[PDB]
Design an enzyme around this catalytic site. Structure first.
Site, short mmCIF file in Angstrom:
data_model
loop_
_atom_site.label_atom_id
_atom_site.label_comp_id
_atom_site.label_asym_id
_atom_site.label_seq_id
_atom_site.Cartn_x
_atom_site.Cartn_y
_atom_site.Cartn_z
N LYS A 231 -0.92 7.13 -7.00
CA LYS A 231 -1.27 8.64 -6.40
C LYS A 231 -2.55 9.23 -7.07
O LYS A 231 -2.44 10.20 -7.50
CB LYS A 231 -0.15 9.55 -6.68
CG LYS A 231 1.03 9.53 -5.47
CD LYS A 231 1.55 8.17 -5.33
CE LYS A 231 2.67 8.00 -6.54
NZ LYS A 231 3.23 6.76 -6.65
N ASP B 59 8.66 -8.71 3.10
CA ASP B 59 8.53 -7.39 3.60
C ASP B 59 7.24 -7.29 4.45
O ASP B 59 7.12 -5.95 5.06
CB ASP B 59 8.87 -6.42 2.84
CG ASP B 59 10.20 -6.51 2.51
OD1 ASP B 59 11.46 -6.86 3.28
OD2 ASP B 59 10.59 -5.77 1.50
N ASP C 93 3.72 -3.18 5.69
CA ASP C 93 5.08 -3.43 5.05
C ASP C 93 6.41 -3.14 5.72
O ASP C 93 6.50 -1.56 5.39
CB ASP C 93 4.84 -2.91 3.47
CG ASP C 93 5.90 -3.27 2.66
OD1 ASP C 93 5.98 -4.37 1.94
OD2 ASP C 93 6.90 -2.41 2.33
#
Ligand code: GTP
Ligand code: GTP
Ligand code: MG
Ligand code: MG
Lengths: 366, 366
Positions: A162, A110, A218
């Site tokens: 995160k 990807d 990606d």
């Protein structure tokens, strides 16, 4: 030296297109993604590629990978399996890898980039993975959520999902190089290289980061697909045969406003405007005054006169109406047909549908 | 005598479940729909069944139809093809039908009823199709949109789509019986029996209607799936081994509010309430205090304690959370997993998804 490409997975984010073909075989620009990666590996010199096939075991991957006849490369296709996660296929293929002294490459199907693979000769300085956790600079690392803390020593301290504090901007790039001893660490079960093996390697201090100077994307989401096409086509315009033009005289008279990729077999109507960073597939037919702004047109797709598809993807065998607007980030399935005058503002249509109603809000057509 | 079952088609209306298996193989109650039809045909005495296989040519239909070993019946599997519409498969299978003197049956894989098949011995009175256009009385004929005008002479005058005037209430039932001469009328191309051959037969006066006294339901839609299951289970409760109960002591102690179908291999909680007209698949696990109101639980699905799924369909290998509510007409894909406390009000979830957010309005989860 050999490579292993993780060609499994359900392609959940690229769902309207991956309900027909596996994610590796989804055409990016005018070629499958895995074909771009295999071409890069062949340019490096890798002759053996190992494909970890779980989704569509033999119906699609084995049959459509006749590219082994071309490219002077061969695929083992001996990692047929049930879903074993991201890291399990390496445990399954430890036998075919033979545990030789030479390291081996690992890739996701990807990722698109310039593919700087000089990490083979470089980063051999006493690494379990020779700069294996290749990283790219992204200013939007909050939403990407996989931040790699790479110091000047390149020793991966930890992986943070995160993070609130500005620990770093580098994120995982999905290209890896491993010494075969890692096959001992990976257990023969469902596991994830990102969330199981890599934290352990970082704790042991055998994980080293490789900085990516060039562009990277990606392309596994339609928005990321479009943006990666925008980033990628300018690199490939001079590479292939597809003024401010790339293919400006294929059919009749039409205008190009920058970089694009039009297949030689595609027919373009009179006075069409193939916009910047647009891909037209083989045997595709484009109407007279169409506007392909930032769209990808795949395979035997037909677009009527006056249609404007922008920043949107259309499937392999669509029949688009005449005066439609397929705007925003809209993805069409394998055999979707759109009636004339229909406006699709960022709506995803599942394969084998007929659209005859306007949809002005993002949504899904079952 | 032989039959032909139209087992092709993309299953667009049952899309969340037909992205994994073809529409004929989608389990209705505790068996595939085509299996119910084949059992009825075997009860007739039909030994040869011809399947018009277009969707999933060999991946699903040929492999999963191991039922040929059982049921004492054999399937030809000689109609593998590209999409040829509803009438084209008969033209393709003309050769294997041999154009014998004996007539042949035609069925759709979407219809459930008592299957009155005495239309073989009956309606032989000089018909091109011996009561071939079988019709059922539905008060909702307007939305169904296929109204058959059957007079006392049973000669079909015309087919009307969404008729404004009350021409009639009978609608097509999807069961047909043809003399083999019809193979001459059908062209070797994509066609529809409903919109090409049947109007011609009605104009020619060789089309005769057969009334349906018993219940009938076209279960190609989730709403129609649920309502047809409600209509059907009371017929089949005494037929199979699955007070006001059908399976009341399968696991621990649980309560049954009416007719249901619980597989012997399913474990049903302790104190659960399996409601009226509910289907539990094989190897399924049900939590302690579940409420299976009007839902269908397919194959190796697991439901946590306290979950309440009503009038909804869950997929084959789901893992439902503990205290969820899957209400309205909600369909779940092959491998959907739902977290605890999630509420899905009529939302269709595509296969291989993880649901962790409350959805209080009908929609699609990509
Ligand atoms: N062989 C194999 N490869 C996988 C599997 N899951 C993910 N991958 C690889 O991991 C990369 C990205 O994951 P995808 O599966 O494509 O994306 P996704 O469908 O959203 O799912 P995840 O990223 O796994 O959460 C691709 O290279 C996949 O081929 C798997 O079960 N088997
Ligand atoms: N062999 C074959 N059978 C079909 C085809 N299309 C429909 N059928 C049959 O017609 C009946 C109902 O149609 P389906 O295709 O299941 O329903 P759908 O997917 O909503 O599409 P249509 O009803 O055809 O508009 C079923 O018996 C199907 O098997 C086809 O292209 N080939
Ligand atoms: Mg990806
Ligand atoms: Mg139907």
């Amino acid at each position: 030296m050999r490579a292993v490409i993780l060609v499994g997975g359900f392609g959940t984010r690229l769902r309207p297109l991956t309900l027909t073909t596996p994610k590796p075989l989804v055409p990016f620009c005018n070629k499958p993604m895995i074909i771009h990666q295999i071409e890069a590996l062949k340019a490096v010199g890798v002759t053996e590629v190992i494909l970890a096939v779980a989704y569509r075991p033999e119906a699609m991957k084995e049959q459509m990978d006749e590219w082994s006849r071309k490219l002077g490369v061969s695929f083992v296709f001996s990692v047929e399996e049930e879903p074993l996660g991201t890291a399990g296929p390496l445990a399954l293929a430890r036998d075919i890898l033979m545990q030789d002294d030479k390291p081996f490459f690992v890739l996701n199907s990807d990722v698109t980039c310039t593919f700087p693979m000089q990490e083979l000769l470089d980063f051999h300085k006493a690494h379990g993975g020779e700069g294996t956790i290749m990283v790219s600079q992204v200013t939007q690392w909050e939403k990407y959520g996989v931040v790699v803390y790479s110091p000047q020593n390149y020793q991966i301290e930890r992986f943070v999902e995160k993070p609130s504090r500005f620990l770093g901007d580098r994120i995982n790039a999905g290209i890896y190089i491993f010494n075969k001893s890692i096959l001992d660490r990976i257990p023969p079960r469902r596991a994830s290289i990102e969330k199981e093996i890599f934290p352990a390697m970082a704790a042991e201090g055998q994980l080293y980061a490789f900085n990516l100077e060039g562009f990277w994307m990606d392309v596994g989401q339609p928005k990321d697909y479009i943006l990666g096409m925008t980033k990628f086509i300018p690199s490939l315009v001079h590479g292939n045969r597809e003024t401010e033009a790339v293919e400006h005289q294929r059919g009749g008279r039409f205008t190009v406003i920058g970089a694009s990729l039009i297949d030689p077999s595609a027919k373009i109507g009179d006075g069409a405007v193939i916009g910047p960073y647009a891909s037209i597939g083989a045997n595709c037919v484009i109407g007279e005054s169409c506007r392909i702004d930032n769209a990808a047109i795949l395979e035997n797709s037909k677009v009527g006169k006056g249609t404007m598809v922008s920043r949107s993807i259309v499937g392999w065998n669509n029949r688009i109406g005449s005066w439609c607007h397929i705007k925003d980030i809209s993805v069409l399935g394998d055999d979707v047909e759109v009636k004339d005058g229909v406006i699709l503002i960022g709506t995803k249509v599942l394969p084998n549908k007929d659209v005859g109603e306007h949809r002005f809000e993002p949504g899904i057509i079952m």
